[PDB]
Design a protein around this motif. Structure first.
Motif, mmCIF file in Angstrom:
data_model
loop_
_atom_site.group_PDB
_atom_site.id
_atom_site.type_symbol
_atom_site.label_atom_id
_atom_site.label_comp_id
_atom_site.label_asym_id
_atom_site.label_seq_id
_atom_site.Cartn_x
_atom_site.Cartn_y
_atom_site.Cartn_z
ATOM 1 N N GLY A 1 0.793 -1.213 0.000
ATOM 2 C CA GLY A 1 0.000 0.000 0.000
ATOM 3 C C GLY A 1 0.828 1.268 0.000
ATOM 4 O O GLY A 1 1.991 1.258 -0.417
ATOM 5 N N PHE A 2 0.240 2.370 0.468
ATOM 6 C CA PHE A 2 0.940 3.652 0.571
ATOM 7 C C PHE A 2 1.815 3.642 1.826
ATOM 8 O O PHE A 2 1.637 4.424 2.762
ATOM 9 N N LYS A 3 2.791 2.739 1.823
ATOM 10 C CA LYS A 3 3.612 2.455 2.987
ATOM 11 C C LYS A 3 5.079 2.745 2.698
ATOM 12 O O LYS A 3 5.521 2.761 1.545
ATOM 13 N N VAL A 4 5.829 2.980 3.774
ATOM 14 C CA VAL A 4 7.275 3.134 3.677
ATOM 15 C C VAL A 4 7.903 1.771 3.408
ATOM 16 O O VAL A 4 7.439 0.743 3.921
ATOM 17 N N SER A 5 8.947 1.755 2.573
ATOM 18 C CA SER A 5 9.622 0.506 2.227
ATOM 19 C C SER A 5 10.169 -0.192 3.468
ATOM 20 O O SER A 5 9.788 -1.327 3.778
ATOM 21 N N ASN A 6 11.063 0.472 4.196
ATOM 22 C CA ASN A 6 11.644 -0.079 5.418
ATOM 23 C C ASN A 6 10.971 0.598 6.607
ATOM 24 O O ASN A 6 11.393 1.671 7.046
ATOM 25 N N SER A 7 9.919 -0.036 7.130
ATOM 26 C CA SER A 7 9.190 0.531 8.258
ATOM 27 C C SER A 7 9.966 0.425 9.565
ATOM 28 O O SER A 7 9.662 1.160 10.511
ATOM 29 N N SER A 8 10.953 -0.471 9.640
ATOM 30 C CA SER A 8 11.739 -0.600 10.861
ATOM 31 C C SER A 8 12.705 0.564 11.040
ATOM 32 O O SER A 8 13.011 0.944 12.175
ATOM 33 N N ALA A 9 13.189 1.139 9.940
ATOM 34 C CA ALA A 9 14.194 2.193 10.007
ATOM 35 C C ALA A 9 13.586 3.581 10.167
ATOM 36 O O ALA A 9 14.086 4.386 10.957
ATOM 37 N N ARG A 10 12.515 3.878 9.434
ATOM 38 C CA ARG A 10 11.952 5.219 9.413
ATOM 39 C C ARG A 10 10.443 5.150 9.232
ATOM 40 O O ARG A 10 9.896 4.156 8.748
ATOM 41 N N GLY A 11 9.780 6.226 9.629
ATOM 42 C CA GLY A 11 8.359 6.426 9.406
ATOM 43 C C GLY A 11 8.108 7.359 8.241
ATOM 44 O O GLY A 11 8.789 7.297 7.212
#
Ligand SMILES: CCCCCCCC(=O)OC[C@H](COP(=O)(O)O[C@@H]1[C@H](O)[C@H](O)[C@@H](OP(=O)(O)O)[C@H](OP(=O)(O)O)[C@H]1O)OC(=O)CCCCCCC
Ligand SMILES: CCCCCCCC(=O)OC[C@H](COP(=O)(O)O[C@@H]1[C@H](O)[C@H](O)[C@@H](OP(=O)(O)O)[C@H](OP(=O)(O)O)[C@H]1O)OC(=O)CCCCCCC
Ligand SMILES: CCCCCCCCCCCC(=O)OC[C@H](COP(=O)(O)OCC[N+](C)(C)C)OC(=O)CCCCCCCCCCC
Ligand SMILES: CCCCCCCCCCCC(=O)OC[C@H](COP(=O)(O)OCC[N+](C)(C)C)OC(=O)CCCCCCCCCCC
Ligand SMILES: *[C@@H]1O[C@H](CO)[C@@H](O)[C@H](O)[C@H]1NC(C)=O
Ligand SMILES: *[C@@H]1O[C@H](CO)[C@@H](O)[C@H](O)[C@H]1NC(C)=O
Lengths: 450, 456
Positions: A235-245
């Motif tokens: 979806g409209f999501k960040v690629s690496n959610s663990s690193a950044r928002g």
């Protein structure tokens, strides 16, 4: 009508480099910025540039020099243990302040100092960078999955393959070569006379999407062999959610951002401004467009999306609507994740090599380098052959090659951030040092701005 | 100087020789292979240099002969026959035909072959080469499929008894690389780069250079298997258990039937037609050379070696000059004979490289084909046609219909080749001679026939 037909070509010509550069950025920056962030940035800045940009012909998108700067700053931050996505925020702040300073004074005075010398050197450097990155990725693929006699039966595939695989490297090479070959043959067919004209121009316009479709289908019908696929969020999501928002906190994400870098981030802003100005000189030629582009890039750096560049009454409104639709559809392309996840990275790197090779067509430096390997009586009927001696032309070419080699060395060294400064150092070289060796009559012919 | 002049024609006669020997070994189950073809080429080259009327004609194996060998092998394996023993009676009937030609000359049959039949034959040979290359690639991919898991306890003593990890993809890469390097070297030959001497020198040896590059590429890849060329230790038969050197008439294993020994004249007629038509293409006095070639082929069939044909080969492509040609031909044939002793070099050549060269030859044989040009003109708009006589004086759809009839003839020939009655392929080809002479004048007028089917 025909507006929706004209939207498609711009959409594909703005999407294929977008996804290719998103894959490259995700590989280089450890997926901290990926396809989703680049697509969102391209969509938002395209909508804004269509609604309120001075010249609708300019399409706002990511490019090679920006990718080189992002890789260099990532290397700098990982060498100094810095928060890279947070340093980009202060880079954007300093870019906005530089935009205000340029608005206050006059910025059109420095436009005329850029000549054909610097532009040709810059474009040749970008093409060599593209080719080198493609071949380095191929070498890394062959190193990760060597051609062995025996492989492990069950290797872990959850993060990535944890061991060598039987047919990954050779099939990746085959896919890259096939993508490049089909793209080049479609380009050659575009300038031929083998089908009716309408079909020829139509098929030649969509050569890159057709080659991509063919090679993705080829890898799709191969079942049991593994190839590295493009990493796209659903979806409209960040690629690496663990690193950044989404919102990047300027005062550090994990650790506190140092004050010394907070104040010294102005120099990387100068380098970014030089890169964007040079690429605008190559493409755009306008201070309102530069205002808008650098301001939107500085604002987008706050939200994690990358900055872009200006790569190139009723009719004006039609261009407004066309740009708005292309930007909106580029934004909606991230929702088409089932298709994007099936695209191998080998096809994208084949397209990368294709772009790198085809950027050399209009390069006078490239033609003049090709003249090094010809006998003196095979030179074409251009003014820089009959008016200047052969060895003088070869010496000019040799000095340009020396400049290119120095730029390549500077890129290779850990002080790769200062590449735009070394690149812009060629302008006083042409204005000051070249008139000492060469004559003016030779210089107007070898450095004609036509 | 001659010691440097013979090298180019040596390589240009050796690379197709080894390619055809490997392919004949594949289709023939090593009844005849690289050793037999090399020995036949050397012996017939010596005997044609010393006795040939026109030294410019080189004697070597070719595509139509390979198709005939395939067809006869399939015919012999369908029935109960020894394939290597029927060739003996084919050669006997060929020698009898040579005896029967010197009585009543066959010079009147030279005029009946026109551009129609020659162009159709060349196009058919090119399509055969391309089809064989792609069929070999498909068979390679079928034998070693792209699987997730492979069994690594596979026996490799006769051949790989199971799928191998990454043999097929490397074979495809080698084939494509060989073909593309050969094409790029050809394109470099007709270019404007480098000193001119060097351009002709490297362009002349494009095929050996491409072969060397790809053999080195395969050589430095250690742990991957690729199917290599099968060359014996020395002056030895490829399959020792099969036939031996002096193949015995009247049966090696079982009794050769008398009816086949009497009906072997028809395959002799077909192979004589093939050799005659290829010699016609070569030419475009001669009776002595043609009958000498056919007689040497018939005699070589008695010892198991294949028969050969004649091809025009120049140096770039009075008594002193003909003597120098004598010595050049003798030296090249002797060196081709000595080439069999280079087992450590020939056994390291992958078959993928040779099939890439095969595809290269098939594609490049289409350059001077007027039928290929008119097929290419089927797609161009009428305004883009060149200023050749068969466009300015011939209406567009008339020459399109001409090309369509030629394509129909090619399709019929292909169907006959795929038909199990594939022995009669040359005879059907001869049927294209009355078709131009009888039926074509009914449809087209004389002017358009002269324009489309030009003598020269
Ligand atoms: C199996 C094939 C059978 C084909 C048999 C029938 C072959 C046949 O009759 O050709 C007709 C057609 C083009 O004919 P045609 O010349 O009338 O078509 C265009 C027309 O001449 C325009 O006026 C030209 O523009 P311009 O005024 O010059 O500026 C344009 O040239 P270009 O500038 O656009 O190039 C022309 O393309 O070509 C095919 O259909 C290719 C079929 C391949 C599929
Ligand atoms: C590689 C090891 C050897 C390197 C030795 C390298 C020695 C070297 O430096 O030569 C330079 C040579 C100069 O050409 P240059 O005109 O002096 O030499 C030839 C001479 O002019 C002949 O008269 C020409 O024939 P013609 O009268 O017109 O009929 C012939 O052209 P062609 O008609 O034959 O085409 C010419 O080649 O060509 C390059 O620049 C390629 C350099 C790339 C390097
Ligand atoms: C567009 C066409 C470009 C072709 C360029 C090919 C790039 C190959 C990169 C090899 C990197 C390397 O040396 O890899 C090292 C690894 C082992 O890795 P290691 O021992 O862990 O180190 O060797 C291997 O298992 C593979 C051996 C090299 C295979 C080369 C195939 C070349 C095919 C050429 C077709 C024209
Ligand atoms: C110019 C140089 C040549 C270029 C053309 C290459 C043709 C390759 C033919 C493959 C079909 C085949 O052979 O497929 C047959 C095999 C075997 O299938 P099986 O189930 O074991 O059959 C059992 C009976 O299928 C496969 O394993 C699929 C292999 C797909 C390979 C795709 C390669 C694409 C190359 C593109 C180059 C630009
Ligand atoms: C996401 O970021 C973390 C921390 O930098 C890193 O360890 C991880 O590898 C990243 N994800 C991917 C897919 O690379
Ligand atoms: C030699 O001939 C025999 C019998 O015809 C056959 O089984 C064998 O495969 C041949 N040898 C090779 C290497 O093919």
């Amino acid at each position: 009508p025909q507006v929706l037909a004209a939207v498609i070509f711009i959409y594909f010509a703005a999407l294929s480099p977008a996804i290719t550069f998103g894959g490259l950025l995700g590989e280089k920056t450890r997926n901290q910025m990926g396809v989703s962030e680049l697509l969102i940035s391209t969509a938002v800045q395209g909508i804004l540039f269509a609604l309120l940009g001075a010249q609708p012909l300019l399409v706002v998108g990511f490019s090679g020099p920006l990718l080189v700067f992002e890789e260099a700053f990532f290397s700098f931050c990982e060498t100094n243990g810095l928060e890279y996505i947070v340093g980009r925020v202060w880079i954007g702040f300093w870019l906005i302040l530089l935009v205000v300073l340029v608005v206050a004074f006059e910025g059109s005075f420095l436009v005329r100092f850029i000549s054909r010398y610097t532009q040709e050197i810059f474009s040749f450097l970008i093409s060599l960078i593209f080719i080198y990155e493609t071949f380095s990725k191929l070498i890394k693929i062959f190193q990760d999955h060597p051609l062995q006699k025996t492989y492990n039966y069950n290797v872990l595939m959850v993060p990535k393959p944890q061991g060598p695989l039987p047919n990954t490297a050779l099939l990746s090479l085959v896919l890259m070569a096939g993508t490049f070959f089909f793209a080049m043959m479609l380009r050659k067919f575009k300038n031929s006379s083998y089908f009716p004209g309408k079909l020829r121009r139509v098929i030649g316009d969509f050569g890159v999407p057709i080659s991509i479709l063919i090679m993705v289908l080829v890898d799709f019908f191969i079942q049991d062999t593994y190839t590295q696929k493009l990493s796209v969020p659903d979806g409209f999501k960040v690629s690496n959610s663990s690193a950044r928002g989404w919102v990047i906190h300027p005062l550090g994400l994990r650790s506190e951002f140092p004050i010394w870098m907070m104040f010294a981030s102005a120099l990387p802003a100068l380098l970014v401004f030089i890169l964007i100005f040079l690429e605008s000189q190559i493409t755009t030629l306008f201070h309102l467009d530069l205002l808008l582009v650098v301001g939107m890039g500085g604002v987008a750096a706050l939200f994690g999306m990358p900055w872009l560049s200006a790569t190139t009454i009723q009719e004006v409104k039609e261009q407004r609507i066309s740009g708005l639709l292309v930007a909106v559809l580029v934004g909606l392309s991230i929702l088409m994740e089932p298709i994007l996840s099936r695209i191998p990275l080998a096809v994208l790197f084949g397209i990368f090599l294709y772009m790198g090779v085809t950027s050399l067509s209009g390069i006078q430096l490239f033609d003049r380098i090709l003249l090094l390997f010809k006998p003196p009586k095979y030179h074409p009927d251009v003014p820089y052959v009959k008016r200047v001696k052969t060895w003088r032309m070869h010496l000019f070419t040799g000095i340009q090659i020396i400049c290119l080699a120095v730029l390549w060395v500077v890129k290779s060294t850990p002080a790769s951030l200062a590449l735009p400064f070394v690149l812009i150092l060629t302008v006083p070289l042409r204005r000051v040092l070249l008139p000492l060796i060469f004559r003016n009559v030779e210089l107007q012919c070898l450095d004609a701005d036509d």
